[PDB]
Design a protein around this ligand. Structure first.
Ligand SMILES: N=C(N)c1cc(-c2ccccc2)c(CNC(=O)c2ccc3cc[nH]c3c2)s1
Ligand SMILES: N=C(N)c1cc(-c2ccccc2)c(CNC(=O)c2ccc3cc[nH]c3c2)s1
Ligand SMILES: N=C(N)c1cc(-c2ccccc2)c(CNC(=O)c2ccc3cc[nH]c3c2)s1
Ligand SMILES: N=C(N)c1cc(-c2ccccc2)c(CNC(=O)c2ccc3cc[nH]c3c2)s1
Ligand SMILES: [Cl-]
Ligand SMILES: [Cl-]
Ligand SMILES: [Mg+2]
Ligand SMILES: [Mg+2]
Ligand SMILES: [Mg+2]
Ligand SMILES: [Mg+2]
Ligand SMILES: [Mg+2]
Ligand SMILES: [Mg+2]
Lengths: 228, 5, 228, 5
């Protein structure tokens, strides 16, 4: 760990600065270092970890999609080689995040809020691996589904339907169903049920909670509009 | 592509 | 050179793919490898080199500005340390580009078109170093000015006033005067003279040349509007 | 910031 010599608090502070500078690779390295200190992460710290790696892998996914499309049309070795290079780097980032979750964020997350957060992340990074997998692929897909479903089960027992982690989990699991599992009806049913159950609970929310929940509800609606 | 968070 | 084993043509092809994937760090590494093959660069290849490093260093500059502003307001060691980290990486990229120009793009550029292109780049990367330098700074600034001015002298002898390399050189040298040399009147005078001389030569241009030249002329006008 | 190319 190249971050092993830096104080945990300094790593968190620098992750926040990297975010403001849109330096997401740095942000992810700082947050990896913070995780490797071995202590549990607070809610803010989990959000910092998630934002950093989401942005890094999101850039890799966007690039992979551009290159894959070019490769498909072309069907020399260069396009394949370069797509493979990006793919391998993306898989490396996913393996790194899954490694952090397995060593040892998930096992040490006692609270439902933390366990759901990390199981959602596990589903997300298996989903990103599944996007680029080509057969191996089945095991990755089933692994994503199992992580998402365990998170769903916990979230339903322990969180209200407006909780933003529960909502984002359902949003992402719905996308998994649509784009990975080739189960669009499951995707649509989950987004709709999630939206309707949250709508019925908005009356319980303060102004701040209402803003969080309705933001994600709009994303659910956006996806349903795309899919129907 | 669809929204995820 | 980690790119030493890849064919020159494959490096160029992959630089073009990286550009389409907005993978500018990769693009710059591919173009560095191409330069290190030791052959002169064509116009398209010079443009690929320039675009790649402009984007890489542009991102670093934007981040450095965010961090410097935070550092200034705060006036622990973390903000300074992280600004210093970004600064050192930016200086490393500038040193890499200046190294390519000195070994041996400039000395082997016989044509005016190529020599002007590389001298402009030399001015640009000394300008980026000057943005972060703090005293050393004087030598960097004078070095940028000398490179820009030599490029200007050649461009005036050998290129028409609408030539897009000549126009972009003047645009950037004008910015150098304004933001680095604290010589706003020189900056404004150069942008205006450059714009007016190009305007008077537009009548000689084909439709394609007219599009190139007027694009940069609009940037000259944009800067003059900012400065007056 | 001003335009450069
Ligand atoms: N630095 C950051 N990026 C965050 C810090 C905290 C935080 C800070 C203090 C205490 C607890 C958590 C975050 C959680 N908050 C959010 O508002 C949020 C809002 C909107 C969206 C849309 C997609 N995802 C979202 C997350 S994000
Ligand atoms: N129980 C709750 N409803 C929350 C408790 C805390 C909290 C916990 C400890 C300290 C400070 C705050 C929350 C902070 N917000 C988030 O994490 C968050 C995450 C994602 C999104 C997307 C849209 N909005 C979002 C908000 S939400
Ligand atoms: N791959 C690329 N990025 C380029 C390939 C070539 C090229 C391709 C074939 C032969 C010769 C040169 C380039 C030069 N052309 C441009 O049009 C250009 C246009 C507009 C702007 C605005 C700021 N800079 C600009 C450059 S850019
Ligand atoms: N003599 C000329 N006027 C040109 C000859 C060639 C050329 C030379 C060899 C092969 C193919 C083309 C040109 C290709 N365009 C550029 O390099 C260029 C660069 C920057 C900008 C900014 C806006 N437009 C731009 C165009 S311009
Ligand atoms: Cl490659
Ligand atoms: Cl640092
Ligand atoms: Mg300590
Ligand atoms: Mg592969
Ligand atoms: Mg615990
Ligand atoms: Mg060869
Ligand atoms: Mg320094
Ligand atoms: Mg020569």
């Amino acid at each position: 760990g190249a971050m092993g010599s830096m104080e945990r608090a300094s790593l968190i502070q620098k992750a926040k600065l990297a975010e403001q500078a849109e330096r997401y690779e740095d942000m992810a390295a700082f947050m990896k270092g913070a995780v490797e200190k071995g202590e549990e992460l607070s809610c803010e710290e989990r959000n910092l970890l998630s934002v950093a790696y989401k942005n890094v892998v999101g850039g890799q996914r966007a690039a992979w999609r551009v290159l894959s499309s070019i490769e498909q049309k072309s069907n020399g070795p260069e396009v394949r080689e370069y797509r493979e290079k990006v793919e391998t780097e993306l898989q490396g980032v996913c393996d790194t995040v899954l490694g952090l979750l397995d060593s040892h964020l998930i096992k040490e997350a006692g609270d439902a809020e933390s366990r759901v957060f990390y199981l959602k992340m596990k589903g997300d990074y298996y989903r990103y691996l599944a996007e680029v997998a080509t057969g191996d692929k089945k095991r990755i897909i089933d692994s994503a589904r199992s992580a998402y479903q365990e998170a769903m089960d916990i979230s339903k027992k322990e969180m209200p339907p407006t909780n933003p982690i529960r909502l984002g989990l359902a949003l992402n699991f719905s996308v998994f169903h649509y784009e990975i599992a080739n189960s669009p009806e499951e995707a649509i049913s989950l987004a709709k049920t999630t939206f309707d159950e949250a709508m019925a609970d908005l009356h319980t929310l303060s102004e701040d909670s209402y803003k969080d929940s309705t933001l994600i509800m709009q994303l659910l609606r956006d996806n349903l509009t795309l899919w129907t | 592509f669809p929204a995820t968070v």
